[PDB]
Enzyme design. Structure first.
Site, PDB file in Angstrom:
ATOM      1  N   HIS A 127       0.941  -1.061  -0.048  1.00 25.72           N
ATOM      2  CA  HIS A 127      -0.051   0.037  -0.016  1.00 25.72           C
ATOM      3  C   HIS A 127       0.960   1.199  -0.259  1.00 25.72           C
ATOM      4  CE1 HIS A 127       0.790  -0.168   4.298  1.00 25.72           C
ATOM      5  NE2 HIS A 127       0.130   0.747   4.805  1.00 25.72           N
TER       6      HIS A 127
ATOM      7  N   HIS B 226       1.457   3.718   2.079  1.00 26.88           N
ATOM      8  CA  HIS B 226       1.932   4.396   3.283  1.00 26.88           C
ATOM      9  C   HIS B 226       3.508   4.110   3.552  1.00 26.88           C
ATOM     10  CE1 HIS B 226      -2.336   4.494   5.539  1.00 26.88           C
ATOM     11  NE2 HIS B 226      -2.009   5.491   4.728  1.00 26.88           N
TER      12      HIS B 226
ATOM     13  N   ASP C  54       5.315   3.126   5.676  1.00 29.23           N
ATOM     14  CA  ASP C  54       5.789   1.774   6.399  1.00 29.23           C
ATOM     15  C   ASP C  54       6.018   0.832   5.203  1.00 29.23           C
ATOM     16  OD1 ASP C  54       2.973   1.486   6.418  1.00 29.23           O
ATOM     17  OD2 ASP C  54       2.864   0.153   8.108  1.00 29.23           O
TER      18      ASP C  54
ATOM     19  N   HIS D  91      -7.919  -1.250   4.878  1.00 27.62           N
ATOM     20  CA  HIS D  91      -7.061  -0.335   5.567  1.00 27.62           C
ATOM     21  C   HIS D  91      -6.814   1.179   4.584  1.00 27.62           C
ATOM     22  CE1 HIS D  91      -3.749   1.439   7.606  1.00 27.62           C
ATOM     23  NE2 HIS D  91      -2.866   1.157   6.508  1.00 27.62           N
TER      24      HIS D  91
ATOM     25  N   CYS E  15      -0.891  -4.225   6.102  1.00 29.17           N
ATOM     26  CA  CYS E  15      -1.912  -3.581   6.932  1.00 29.17           C
ATOM     27  C   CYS E  15      -3.105  -3.588   6.906  1.00 29.17           C
ATOM     28  CB  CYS E  15      -1.448  -1.961   7.140  1.00 29.17           C
ATOM     29  SG  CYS E  15       0.338  -1.866   7.122  1.00 29.17           S
TER      30      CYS E  15
ATOM     31  N   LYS F 207      -5.665  -7.204  10.522  1.00 29.85           N
ATOM     32  CA  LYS F 207      -5.846  -6.045  11.877  1.00 29.85           C
ATOM     33  C   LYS F 207      -6.753  -6.860  12.975  1.00 29.85           C
ATOM     34  CE  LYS F 207      -4.360  -1.763  10.662  1.00 29.85           C
ATOM     35  NZ  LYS F 207      -2.930  -2.511  10.677  1.00 29.85           N
TER      36      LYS F 207
ATOM     37  N   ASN G 209      -5.368   3.221  12.597  1.00 30.74           N
ATOM     38  CA  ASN G 209      -5.683   4.441  11.948  1.00 30.74           C
ATOM     39  C   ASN G 209      -6.841   4.609  10.902  1.00 30.74           C
ATOM     40  OD1 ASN G 209      -5.623   7.218  11.055  1.00 30.74           O
ATOM     41  ND2 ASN G 209      -3.402   7.279  12.120  1.00 30.74           N
TER      42      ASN G 209
ATOM     43  N   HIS H 153       1.388  -5.215  11.459  1.00 36.16           N
ATOM     44  CA  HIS H 153       1.855  -4.577  13.035  1.00 36.16           C
ATOM     45  C   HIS H 153       1.333  -5.435  14.014  1.00 36.16           C
ATOM     46  CE1 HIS H 153       2.477  -0.818  10.893  1.00 36.16           C
ATOM     47  NE2 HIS H 153       1.160  -0.763  10.428  1.00 36.16           N
TER      48      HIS H 153
HETATM   49 ZN   LIG Z   1      -0.809   2.088   5.998  1.00 35.84          ZN
HETATM   50 ZN   LIG Z   2       0.868  -0.095   8.318  1.00 34.18          ZN
END
Ligand SMILES: [Zn+2]
Ligand SMILES: [Zn+2]
Ligand SMILES: O=C1CCc2cc(-c3csc(COc4ccccc4)n3)ccc2N1
Ligand SMILES: O=C1CCc2cc(-c3csc(COc4ccccc4)n3)ccc2N1
Ligand SMILES: [Zn+2]
Ligand SMILES: [Zn+2]
Lengths: 227, 228
Positions: free
Chosen positions: B81, B83, B85, B143, B162, B165, B171, B201
Protein backbone atom coordinates in the site's frame (compact mmCIF):
# COMPACT_ATOMS: atom_id res chain seq x y z
CA UNK A 1 2.30 2.62 30.26
CA UNK A 2 0.53 3.74 33.41
CA UNK A 3 -2.23 5.29 31.31
CA UNK A 4 -5.42 3.76 29.88
CA UNK A 5 -5.08 2.83 26.21
CA UNK A 6 -8.31 4.49 25.10
CA UNK A 7 -8.58 2.84 21.81
CA UNK A 8 -7.79 -0.79 22.72
CA UNK A 9 -10.52 -3.35 21.99
CA UNK A 10 -12.70 -4.25 24.87
CA UNK A 11 -12.55 -7.42 26.89
CA UNK A 12 -13.78 -10.39 24.86
CA UNK A 13 -15.58 -13.45 26.25
CA UNK A 14 -16.21 -16.47 24.04
CA UNK A 15 -17.35 -20.00 24.70
CA UNK A 16 -14.64 -22.52 23.85
CA UNK A 17 -16.17 -25.76 25.01
CA UNK A 18 -18.75 -27.08 27.35
CA UNK A 19 -17.50 -25.92 30.56
CA UNK A 20 -15.04 -23.40 29.34
CA UNK A 21 -14.78 -19.82 28.12
CA UNK A 22 -11.83 -17.93 26.70
CA UNK A 23 -11.38 -14.35 27.89
CA UNK A 24 -9.23 -12.01 25.82
CA UNK A 25 -7.88 -8.72 27.01
CA UNK A 26 -5.63 -6.30 25.16
CA UNK A 27 -2.79 -3.98 26.06
CA UNK A 28 -0.43 -1.57 24.29
CA UNK A 29 3.10 -2.96 24.83
CA UNK A 30 6.25 -1.17 23.80
CA UNK A 31 7.90 -2.69 20.82
CA UNK A 32 5.05 -5.11 20.01
CA UNK A 33 1.86 -3.73 18.93
CA UNK A 34 -1.35 -4.21 20.66
CA UNK A 35 -0.89 -7.57 22.45
CA UNK A 36 -3.83 -9.96 23.03
CA UNK A 37 -3.89 -12.11 26.14
CA UNK A 38 -6.08 -15.18 26.46
CA UNK A 39 -7.14 -16.75 29.71
CA UNK A 40 -10.03 -19.06 30.64
CA UNK A 41 -13.06 -19.18 32.85
CA UNK A 42 -13.86 -22.77 33.80
CA UNK A 43 -17.26 -23.51 35.34
CA UNK A 44 -17.52 -26.17 38.04
CA UNK A 45 -20.87 -26.59 39.76
CA UNK A 46 -21.85 -23.42 37.84
CA UNK A 47 -19.18 -21.51 39.79
CA UNK A 48 -16.40 -19.77 37.90
CA UNK A 49 -12.66 -20.36 38.10
CA UNK A 50 -10.50 -17.75 36.37
CA UNK A 51 -7.49 -19.22 34.62
CA UNK A 52 -5.12 -16.18 34.61
CA UNK A 53 -6.53 -12.72 35.18
CA UNK A 54 -6.81 -10.07 32.41
CA UNK A 55 -4.01 -7.51 32.17
CA UNK A 56 -5.85 -4.97 34.36
CA UNK A 57 -8.27 -4.50 37.26
CA UNK A 58 -10.80 -2.92 34.88
CA UNK A 59 -11.00 -6.02 32.72
CA UNK A 60 -10.85 -8.36 35.70
CA UNK A 61 -13.89 -6.49 37.07
CA UNK A 62 -15.66 -6.67 33.68
CA UNK A 63 -14.94 -10.37 33.44
CA UNK A 64 -16.19 -11.06 36.97
CA UNK A 65 -19.26 -8.87 36.55
CA UNK A 66 -20.28 -10.70 33.36
CA UNK A 67 -20.30 -14.10 35.05
CA UNK A 68 -21.71 -12.87 38.35
CA UNK A 69 -24.54 -11.00 36.59
CA UNK A 70 -25.43 -14.34 35.05
CA UNK A 71 -25.46 -16.19 38.42
CA UNK A 72 -21.94 -17.65 38.23
CA UNK A 73 -20.20 -16.58 41.42
CA UNK A 74 -16.40 -16.66 41.43
CA UNK A 75 -14.81 -19.58 43.30
CA UNK A 76 -11.20 -18.49 42.62
CA UNK A 77 -8.45 -17.41 40.24
CA UNK A 78 -5.20 -19.11 39.37
CA UNK A 79 -2.26 -17.33 37.70
CA UNK A 80 0.06 -19.22 35.40
CA UNK A 81 3.16 -17.01 36.03
CA UNK A 82 4.14 -13.73 37.65
CA UNK A 83 3.96 -11.26 34.72
CA UNK A 84 1.05 -8.79 34.99
CA UNK A 85 -0.76 -10.28 31.98
CA UNK A 86 -1.51 -13.31 34.26
CA UNK A 87 -1.58 -11.58 37.63
CA UNK A 88 -2.82 -8.03 37.04
CA UNK A 89 -6.29 -8.64 38.58
CA UNK A 90 -5.03 -10.34 41.75
CA UNK A 91 -5.32 -7.24 43.92
CA UNK A 92 -8.89 -6.57 42.75
CA UNK A 93 -9.86 -10.16 43.44
CA UNK A 94 -8.16 -10.06 46.87
CA UNK A 95 -10.13 -6.93 47.70
CA UNK A 96 -13.33 -8.85 46.93
CA UNK A 97 -12.12 -11.81 49.11
CA UNK A 98 -12.11 -14.07 46.05
CA UNK A 99 -9.36 -16.66 46.66
CA UNK A 100 -6.35 -16.24 44.37
CA UNK A 101 -3.84 -19.04 43.60
CA UNK A 102 -0.20 -18.97 42.45
CA UNK A 103 2.79 -21.22 42.92
CA UNK A 104 5.15 -20.44 45.77
CA UNK A 105 7.80 -19.39 43.28
CA UNK A 106 5.31 -17.18 41.39
CA UNK A 107 4.38 -15.42 44.65
CA UNK A 108 8.05 -15.00 45.49
CA UNK A 109 8.58 -13.42 42.07
CA UNK A 110 5.55 -11.15 42.59
CA UNK A 111 6.89 -10.05 45.94
CA UNK A 112 10.39 -9.46 44.57
CA UNK A 113 8.75 -7.14 42.19
CA UNK A 114 6.62 -5.43 44.93
CA UNK A 115 3.45 -6.86 43.42
CA UNK A 116 0.48 -8.07 45.52
CA UNK A 117 0.62 -11.88 46.05
CA UNK A 118 -2.03 -14.56 45.62
CA UNK A 119 -3.61 -15.51 48.94
CA UNK A 120 -3.21 -19.29 48.22
CA UNK A 121 0.08 -20.84 47.10
CA UNK A 122 1.25 -24.35 46.17
CA UNK A 123 4.79 -25.73 46.28
CA UNK A 124 5.77 -28.51 43.93
CA UNK A 125 5.14 -29.87 40.48
CA UNK A 126 1.46 -30.89 40.39
CA UNK A 127 -1.42 -29.26 42.16
CA UNK A 128 -5.06 -30.19 41.78
CA UNK A 129 -6.97 -26.98 41.95
CA UNK A 130 -10.10 -29.14 41.46
CA UNK A 131 -9.54 -32.90 41.61
CA UNK A 132 -10.22 -34.49 38.18
CA UNK A 133 -11.25 -31.14 36.71
CA UNK A 134 -8.48 -28.48 36.98
CA UNK A 135 -4.81 -29.53 37.32
CA UNK A 136 -1.69 -27.45 37.44
CA UNK A 137 1.62 -28.69 36.21
CA UNK A 138 5.16 -27.35 36.21
CA UNK A 139 7.07 -28.37 33.05
CA UNK A 140 10.22 -26.54 34.11
CA UNK A 141 11.65 -23.12 33.19
CA UNK A 142 10.80 -21.56 29.81
CA UNK A 143 9.11 -18.22 29.19
CA UNK A 144 9.82 -17.64 32.87
CA UNK A 145 11.26 -19.62 35.77
CA UNK A 146 7.81 -20.12 37.34
CA UNK A 147 5.55 -20.76 34.32
CA UNK A 148 2.91 -23.49 34.88
CA UNK A 149 0.16 -24.99 32.71
CA UNK A 150 -3.46 -25.83 33.60
CA UNK A 151 -5.03 -29.04 32.30
CA UNK A 152 -8.77 -29.77 32.13
CA UNK A 153 -8.87 -33.59 31.99
CA UNK A 154 -12.53 -33.80 31.13
CA UNK A 155 -12.17 -31.65 28.09
CA UNK A 156 -8.63 -32.57 27.11
CA UNK A 157 -7.92 -28.79 27.02
CA UNK A 158 -4.44 -27.45 27.93
CA UNK A 159 -3.97 -23.85 28.94
CA UNK A 160 -0.35 -23.29 28.03
CA UNK A 161 -0.19 -19.65 29.02
CA UNK A 162 2.87 -17.77 27.96
CA UNK A 163 4.87 -20.99 27.74
CA UNK A 164 3.16 -21.96 24.49
CA UNK A 165 4.79 -19.87 21.73
CA UNK A 166 4.20 -21.41 18.30
CA UNK A 167 5.40 -18.63 16.10
CA UNK A 168 8.14 -17.12 18.25
CA UNK A 169 9.15 -16.83 21.86
CA UNK A 170 7.93 -13.27 22.63
CA UNK A 171 9.33 -11.21 25.53
CA UNK A 172 12.57 -13.00 26.52
CA UNK A 173 13.32 -10.75 29.45
CA UNK A 174 12.70 -13.34 32.12
CA UNK A 175 13.19 -16.43 29.98
CA UNK A 176 15.46 -19.44 30.45
CA UNK A 177 16.33 -20.53 26.91
CA UNK A 178 18.72 -23.25 27.96
CA UNK A 179 15.92 -24.95 29.79
CA UNK A 180 12.96 -24.16 27.55
CA UNK A 181 13.69 -26.98 25.02
CA UNK A 182 13.75 -29.61 27.77
CA UNK A 183 10.60 -28.16 29.39
CA UNK A 184 8.74 -28.04 26.06
CA UNK A 185 9.67 -31.65 25.30
CA UNK A 186 8.49 -32.79 28.67
CA UNK A 187 5.21 -30.89 28.22
CA UNK A 188 4.69 -32.34 24.78
CA UNK A 189 4.99 -35.96 25.88
CA UNK A 190 2.64 -35.39 28.72
CA UNK A 191 -0.13 -33.64 26.86
CA UNK A 192 0.39 -34.89 23.36
CA UNK A 193 -3.31 -35.78 22.73
CA UNK A 194 -4.79 -32.61 24.12
CA UNK A 195 -7.78 -31.70 22.00
CA UNK A 196 -6.97 -27.97 22.32
CA UNK A 197 -4.00 -25.83 23.43
CA UNK A 198 -4.63 -22.23 24.50
CA UNK A 199 -1.58 -19.93 24.21
CA UNK A 200 -1.60 -16.59 26.01
CA UNK A 201 -0.71 -14.62 22.91
CA UNK A 202 -1.77 -16.77 19.93
CA UNK A 203 -5.20 -17.99 19.21
CA UNK A 204 -6.24 -21.56 20.19
CA UNK A 205 -4.85 -24.57 18.32
CA UNK A 206 -4.65 -28.33 18.48
CA UNK A 207 -1.78 -30.34 20.06
CA UNK A 208 0.55 -29.35 17.21
CA UNK A 209 1.03 -26.11 19.14
CA UNK A 210 3.19 -28.24 21.51
CA UNK A 211 5.47 -29.35 18.71
CA UNK A 212 5.71 -25.80 17.34
CA UNK A 213 6.74 -24.46 20.78
CA UNK A 214 9.44 -27.05 21.09
CA UNK A 215 10.80 -26.16 17.64
CA UNK A 216 10.75 -22.47 18.50
CA UNK A 217 12.62 -23.20 21.76
CA UNK A 218 15.23 -25.31 20.03
CA UNK A 219 15.44 -22.45 17.50
CA UNK A 220 15.98 -19.66 20.03
CA UNK A 221 18.53 -21.72 21.95
CA UNK A 222 20.55 -22.30 18.80
CA UNK A 223 20.43 -18.74 17.66
CA UNK A 224 21.45 -17.58 21.09
CA UNK A 225 24.62 -19.56 20.99
CA UNK A 226 26.17 -17.12 18.50
CA UNK A 227 27.53 -14.72 16.63
CA UNK B 1 9.04 12.23 22.31
CA UNK B 2 12.07 9.92 22.73
CA UNK B 3 15.36 11.74 23.21
CA UNK B 4 17.81 12.93 20.49
CA UNK B 5 20.07 9.99 21.32
CA UNK B 6 17.21 7.49 21.61
CA UNK B 7 17.26 5.01 18.69
CA UNK B 8 14.20 2.62 18.22
CA UNK B 9 15.01 -1.16 18.20
CA UNK B 10 17.21 -2.04 15.24
CA UNK B 11 15.88 -3.66 12.10
CA UNK B 12 15.44 -7.38 12.76
CA UNK B 13 15.62 -10.21 10.20
CA UNK B 14 14.33 -13.73 11.10
CA UNK B 15 13.91 -16.95 9.17
CA UNK B 16 10.16 -17.78 9.00
CA UNK B 17 10.24 -20.82 6.69
CA UNK B 18 12.57 -22.25 4.11
CA UNK B 19 12.19 -19.69 1.54
CA UNK B 20 11.18 -16.78 3.60
CA UNK B 21 12.39 -14.08 6.05
CA UNK B 22 10.47 -11.57 8.20
CA UNK B 23 11.99 -8.11 8.54
CA UNK B 24 10.79 -5.89 11.35
CA UNK B 25 11.39 -2.14 11.56
CA UNK B 26 10.09 0.31 14.15
CA UNK B 27 8.81 3.89 14.32
CA UNK B 28 7.53 5.77 17.40
CA UNK B 29 3.97 7.02 17.28
CA UNK B 30 4.20 9.95 19.53
CA UNK B 31 2.50 8.82 22.82
CA UNK B 32 1.19 5.46 21.65
CA UNK B 33 4.77 4.07 21.80
CA UNK B 34 7.10 2.10 19.54
CA UNK B 35 5.25 0.03 16.94
CA UNK B 36 6.73 -2.76 14.76
CA UNK B 37 6.29 -3.14 10.98
CA UNK B 38 6.79 -6.58 9.31
CA UNK B 39 7.66 -7.25 5.68
CA UNK B 40 9.13 -10.30 4.01
CA UNK B 41 12.19 -11.19 2.05
CA UNK B 42 11.32 -14.09 -0.24
CA UNK B 43 14.09 -16.16 -1.75
CA UNK B 44 13.93 -17.92 -5.08
CA UNK B 45 17.39 -19.51 -5.49
CA UNK B 46 19.81 -16.75 -4.68
CA UNK B 47 17.42 -13.94 -5.83
CA UNK B 48 15.74 -11.98 -3.10
CA UNK B 49 12.41 -10.14 -3.37
CA UNK B 50 11.49 -7.51 -0.78
CA UNK B 51 7.87 -7.69 0.32
CA UNK B 52 7.32 -4.11 1.66
CA UNK B 53 10.35 -1.86 2.35
CA UNK B 54 11.13 -0.60 5.85
CA UNK B 55 10.01 2.91 6.81
CA UNK B 56 13.41 4.42 6.02
CA UNK B 57 16.04 4.59 3.34
CA UNK B 58 18.56 3.68 6.09
CA UNK B 59 16.74 0.48 7.07
CA UNK B 60 16.00 -0.39 3.43
CA UNK B 61 19.75 -0.14 2.91
CA UNK B 62 20.48 -2.31 6.00
CA UNK B 63 18.00 -4.92 4.82
CA UNK B 64 19.43 -5.01 1.27
CA UNK B 65 23.08 -5.33 2.41
CA UNK B 66 22.23 -8.14 4.78
CA UNK B 67 21.13 -10.23 1.80
CA UNK B 68 23.78 -8.99 -0.61
CA UNK B 69 26.47 -10.16 1.78
CA UNK B 70 24.88 -13.58 1.96
CA UNK B 71 25.21 -13.83 -1.78
CA UNK B 72 21.71 -12.91 -3.05
CA UNK B 73 20.88 -10.60 -5.94
CA UNK B 74 18.05 -8.18 -4.99
CA UNK B 75 15.72 -8.72 -7.90
CA UNK B 76 13.04 -6.24 -6.75
CA UNK B 77 10.58 -4.99 -4.17
CA UNK B 78 6.84 -4.73 -4.02
CA UNK B 79 4.87 -2.35 -1.80
CA UNK B 80 1.55 -3.53 -0.37
CA UNK B 81 0.00 0.00 0.00
CA UNK B 82 1.12 3.61 -0.32
CA UNK B 83 1.85 4.38 3.36
CA UNK B 84 5.49 5.04 4.32
CA UNK B 85 5.73 1.79 6.26
CA UNK B 86 5.48 -0.06 2.90
CA UNK B 87 7.11 2.44 0.47
CA UNK B 88 9.58 4.40 2.54
CA UNK B 89 12.61 3.00 0.79
CA UNK B 90 11.38 3.00 -2.84
CA UNK B 91 13.34 6.18 -3.52
CA UNK B 92 16.54 4.50 -2.27
CA UNK B 93 15.90 1.27 -4.18
CA UNK B 94 15.27 3.32 -7.35
CA UNK B 95 18.58 5.13 -6.76
CA UNK B 96 20.35 1.76 -6.90
CA UNK B 97 18.39 0.53 -9.98
CA UNK B 98 16.63 -2.25 -8.00
CA UNK B 99 13.23 -2.67 -9.76
CA UNK B 100 10.37 -1.43 -7.53
CA UNK B 101 6.68 -2.47 -8.02
CA UNK B 102 3.33 -1.17 -6.80
CA UNK B 103 -0.23 -1.26 -8.10
CA UNK B 104 -1.31 1.47 -10.49
CA UNK B 105 -3.48 2.85 -7.73
CA UNK B 106 -0.68 2.77 -5.14
CA UNK B 107 1.61 4.71 -7.52
CA UNK B 108 -1.15 7.21 -8.14
CA UNK B 109 -1.53 7.69 -4.39
CA UNK B 110 2.21 8.13 -4.00
CA UNK B 111 2.33 10.76 -6.76
CA UNK B 112 -0.76 12.46 -5.28
CA UNK B 113 1.05 12.64 -1.91
CA UNK B 114 4.19 14.08 -3.58
CA UNK B 115 6.16 10.89 -2.98
CA UNK B 116 8.52 8.93 -5.21
CA UNK B 117 6.75 6.25 -7.23
CA UNK B 118 7.71 2.63 -7.94
CA UNK B 119 9.20 2.18 -11.35
CA UNK B 120 6.80 -0.61 -12.38
CA UNK B 121 3.01 -0.76 -12.02
CA UNK B 122 0.61 -3.62 -12.17
CA UNK B 123 -3.05 -3.57 -12.35
CA UNK B 124 -5.55 -6.27 -11.99
CA UNK B 125 -6.84 -8.37 -9.20
CA UNK B 126 -4.19 -11.09 -9.29
CA UNK B 127 -0.69 -10.40 -10.43
CA UNK B 128 2.30 -12.78 -10.36
CA UNK B 129 5.33 -10.88 -9.15
CA UNK B 130 7.13 -14.21 -9.73
CA UNK B 131 5.22 -16.89 -11.67
CA UNK B 132 4.13 -19.83 -9.43
CA UNK B 133 6.00 -18.40 -6.46
CA UNK B 134 4.92 -14.91 -5.45
CA UNK B 135 1.30 -13.84 -6.11
CA UNK B 136 -0.27 -10.45 -5.36
CA UNK B 137 -4.03 -10.20 -4.69
CA UNK B 138 -6.35 -7.22 -4.32
CA UNK B 139 -9.17 -8.04 -1.89
CA UNK B 140 -10.84 -4.65 -2.21
CA UNK B 141 -10.48 -1.47 -0.13
CA UNK B 142 -10.02 -1.62 3.62
CA UNK B 143 -7.06 -0.17 5.51
CA UNK B 144 -6.51 1.90 2.34
CA UNK B 145 -8.21 1.83 -1.09
CA UNK B 146 -5.10 0.23 -2.60
CA UNK B 147 -4.02 -2.43 -0.08
CA UNK B 148 -2.84 -5.74 -1.57
CA UNK B 149 -1.76 -9.03 -0.06
CA UNK B 150 1.08 -11.33 -1.10
CA UNK B 151 0.68 -15.14 -1.25
CA UNK B 152 3.49 -17.74 -1.41
CA UNK B 153 1.63 -20.78 -2.80
CA UNK B 154 4.62 -23.04 -2.12
CA UNK B 155 4.85 -22.28 1.62
CA UNK B 156 1.15 -21.37 1.94
CA UNK B 157 2.14 -18.10 3.70
CA UNK B 158 -0.01 -15.00 3.29
CA UNK B 159 1.53 -11.59 3.90
CA UNK B 160 -1.56 -9.56 4.73
CA UNK B 161 0.17 -6.28 5.32
CA UNK B 162 -1.81 -3.55 7.01
CA UNK B 163 -5.08 -5.10 5.81
CA UNK B 164 -4.82 -7.82 8.48
CA UNK B 165 -5.86 -6.17 11.74
CA UNK B 166 -6.96 -8.90 14.14
CA UNK B 167 -6.92 -6.74 17.30
CA UNK B 168 -8.37 -3.50 16.08
CA UNK B 169 -8.38 -1.61 12.80
CA UNK B 170 -5.79 1.02 13.66
CA UNK B 171 -5.81 4.47 12.11
CA UNK B 172 -8.88 4.90 9.76
CA UNK B 173 -7.70 8.20 8.32
CA UNK B 174 -7.23 6.68 4.86
CA UNK B 175 -9.43 3.62 5.21
CA UNK B 176 -12.61 2.55 3.47
CA UNK B 177 -14.51 1.24 6.47
CA UNK B 178 -17.68 0.63 4.45
CA UNK B 179 -15.77 -1.74 2.12
CA UNK B 180 -13.49 -3.46 4.61
CA UNK B 181 -16.03 -6.07 5.81
CA UNK B 182 -16.72 -7.28 2.25
CA UNK B 183 -13.05 -7.19 1.33
CA UNK B 184 -12.15 -9.13 4.48
CA UNK B 185 -14.70 -11.82 3.73
CA UNK B 186 -13.41 -12.17 0.18
CA UNK B 187 -9.86 -12.45 1.55
CA UNK B 188 -10.93 -15.08 4.12
CA UNK B 189 -12.77 -17.14 1.63
CA UNK B 190 -9.73 -17.13 -0.76
CA UNK B 191 -6.94 -17.82 1.74
CA UNK B 192 -8.64 -19.81 4.50
CA UNK B 193 -6.08 -22.56 4.12
CA UNK B 194 -3.00 -20.43 4.70
CA UNK B 195 -0.54 -22.12 7.03
CA UNK B 196 0.66 -18.70 8.20
CA UNK B 197 -0.67 -15.15 8.07
CA UNK B 198 1.81 -12.26 8.56
CA UNK B 199 0.29 -8.93 9.63
CA UNK B 200 2.19 -5.65 9.30
CA UNK B 201 1.65 -4.55 12.90
CA UNK B 202 1.14 -7.68 15.02
CA UNK B 203 2.78 -11.09 15.12
CA UNK B 204 2.57 -14.06 12.79
CA UNK B 205 -0.41 -16.30 13.27
CA UNK B 206 -2.37 -18.91 11.41
CA UNK B 207 -5.39 -18.54 9.22
CA UNK B 208 -7.45 -17.53 12.36
CA UNK B 209 -6.23 -14.03 11.69
CA UNK B 210 -8.45 -13.87 8.61
CA UNK B 211 -11.49 -14.48 10.77
CA UNK B 212 -10.35 -12.01 13.44
CA UNK B 213 -9.88 -9.32 10.77
CA UNK B 214 -13.38 -9.83 9.39
CA UNK B 215 -14.81 -9.56 12.90
CA UNK B 216 -12.86 -6.35 13.58
CA UNK B 217 -13.91 -4.90 10.18
CA UNK B 218 -17.58 -5.53 10.86
CA UNK B 219 -17.38 -4.17 14.38
CA UNK B 220 -15.47 -1.09 13.20
CA UNK B 221 -18.14 -0.42 10.60
CA UNK B 222 -20.86 -0.80 13.26
CA UNK B 223 -19.09 1.60 15.67
CA UNK B 224 -18.45 4.22 13.07
CA UNK B 225 -22.18 3.87 12.12
CA UNK B 226 -23.95 4.39 15.60
CA UNK B 227 -25.26 7.96 15.83
CA UNK B 228 -23.39 8.18 19.24
ZN1 LIG C 1 -0.90 1.82 6.22
ZN1 LIG D 1 0.91 -0.09 8.31
O1 LIG E 1 9.91 -18.79 14.18
C1 LIG E 1 10.12 -17.56 14.21
C2 LIG E 1 10.88 -16.84 15.19
C3 LIG E 1 10.03 -15.70 15.79
C4 LIG E 1 9.51 -14.79 14.83
C5 LIG E 1 9.12 -13.44 14.95
C6 LIG E 1 8.53 -12.69 13.89
C7 LIG E 1 8.32 -11.38 14.03
C8 LIG E 1 7.97 -10.63 12.99
S1 LIG E 1 8.00 -9.05 13.53
C9 LIG E 1 8.24 -9.36 15.14
C10 LIG E 1 8.31 -8.14 16.05
O2 LIG E 1 9.50 -8.32 16.79
C11 LIG E 1 10.11 -7.31 17.44
C12 LIG E 1 9.81 -6.01 17.52
C13 LIG E 1 10.52 -5.26 18.48
C14 LIG E 1 11.38 -5.66 19.44
C15 LIG E 1 11.52 -7.02 19.44
C16 LIG E 1 10.85 -7.77 18.49
N1 LIG E 1 8.45 -10.69 15.22
C17 LIG E 1 8.27 -13.37 12.69
C18 LIG E 1 8.54 -14.72 12.65
C19 LIG E 1 9.31 -15.37 13.50
N2 LIG E 1 9.39 -16.73 13.44
O1 LIG F 1 3.68 -5.87 32.18
C1 LIG F 1 4.17 -6.42 31.22
C2 LIG F 1 4.02 -6.00 29.83
C3 LIG F 1 3.48 -7.18 28.99
C4 LIG F 1 4.28 -8.33 29.02
C5 LIG F 1 4.46 -9.37 28.08
C6 LIG F 1 5.26 -10.52 28.28
C7 LIG F 1 5.46 -11.46 27.32
C8 LIG F 1 6.32 -12.46 27.45
S1 LIG F 1 6.38 -13.47 26.05
C9 LIG F 1 5.20 -12.55 25.30
C10 LIG F 1 4.59 -12.79 23.90
O2 LIG F 1 4.30 -11.50 23.37
C11 LIG F 1 3.73 -11.40 22.13
C12 LIG F 1 3.47 -12.49 21.31
C13 LIG F 1 3.00 -12.22 20.04
C14 LIG F 1 2.90 -10.89 19.70
C15 LIG F 1 3.29 -9.78 20.39
C16 LIG F 1 3.72 -10.10 21.65
N1 LIG F 1 4.83 -11.55 26.13
C17 LIG F 1 5.85 -10.63 29.55
C18 LIG F 1 5.54 -9.68 30.50
C19 LIG F 1 5.04 -8.48 30.27
N2 LIG F 1 4.69 -7.67 31.30
ZN1 LIG G 1 4.96 -13.49 30.61
ZN1 LIG H 1 2.60 -13.19 28.32
Amino acid sequence: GPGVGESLPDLKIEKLDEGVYVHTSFEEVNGWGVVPKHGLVVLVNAEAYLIDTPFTAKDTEKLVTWFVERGYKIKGSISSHFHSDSTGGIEWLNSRSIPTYASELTNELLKKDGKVQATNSFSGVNYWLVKNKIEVFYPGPGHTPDNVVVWLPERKILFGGCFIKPYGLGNLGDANIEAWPKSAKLLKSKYGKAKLVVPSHSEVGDASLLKLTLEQAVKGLNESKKP
